[PDB]
Amino acid sequence: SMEQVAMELRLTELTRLLRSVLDQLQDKDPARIFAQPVSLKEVPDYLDHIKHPMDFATMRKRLEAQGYKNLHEFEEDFDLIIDNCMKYNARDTVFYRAAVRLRDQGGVVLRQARREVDSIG
Ligand code: NA
């Protein structure tokens, strides 16, 4: 149907917008702390601590399968990146502080993304 097609075109345009968002977020992480999964072969106890690991590469894979139906879903995954880091690592560490800074800077990006998604429909 043509109604199904129109829904598909909308999902594709949201995907495009969320790609630009993901690139902007990732530019706020020049050290590439959040780029890839934590290796279970180097924080071997990681999964006893953190139940739902997340990273930017994992988000990109979901994005390319048009796997985010709305901005809220994408935001949840970004918040897992930040939140997991703030739990596993202590307040005094470079990792925790990098997560605080990424959350602050990503706030700006996400705030406009919401206005654009709302505005475009
Ligand atoms: Na902690």
Which domains are present in the chain? Answer: 1-121 (1.20.920.10)
Residue 111 near residue 43, CB atoms below 8 Å: no
How far is ligand 1, taken at its centre, from the CA of residue 56, in Å? 21
What DSSP assignment string belongs to 32-92?
A: -TTSSPPPTTTSTTHHHH-SS---HHHHHHHHHTT--SSHHHHHHHHHHHHHHHHHHS-TT
Read off the tokens for 86. Answer: 């703030």
Return d(Cα 22, Cα 17) in angstroms, integer: 9
How many angstroms is it from 113 CA to the middle of ligand 1? 30
Q: How far is the CA of 96 from the centre of ligand 1 (A)?
A: 9
Q: Give me the helix-helix angle, 94-120 and 2-27, nearest 10°.
A: 150
Q: How far is the CA of 99 from the centre of ligand 1 (A)?
A: 12
Residue 96's CB is within 10 A of a number of other CB atoms, namely 17
Q: Determined by which method?
A: X-ray
Cα 57 to the center of its chain, rounded Å: 9
Contacts of 91 (CB under 8 A, 6+ apart): none
Determine the distance separating the centroid of ligand 1 and the alpha carbon of 40, expressed in angstroms. Answer: 18
86 CA to middle of ligand 1, Å?
Answer: 6
Distance 50 CA to ligand 1 centre (A): 11
Name the resolution in angstroms: 1.8
CB-based contacts of 84, cutoff 8 Å, min separation 6: 50, 52, 53, 54
What is the 89 CA–ligand 1 centroid distance (Å)?
A: 5
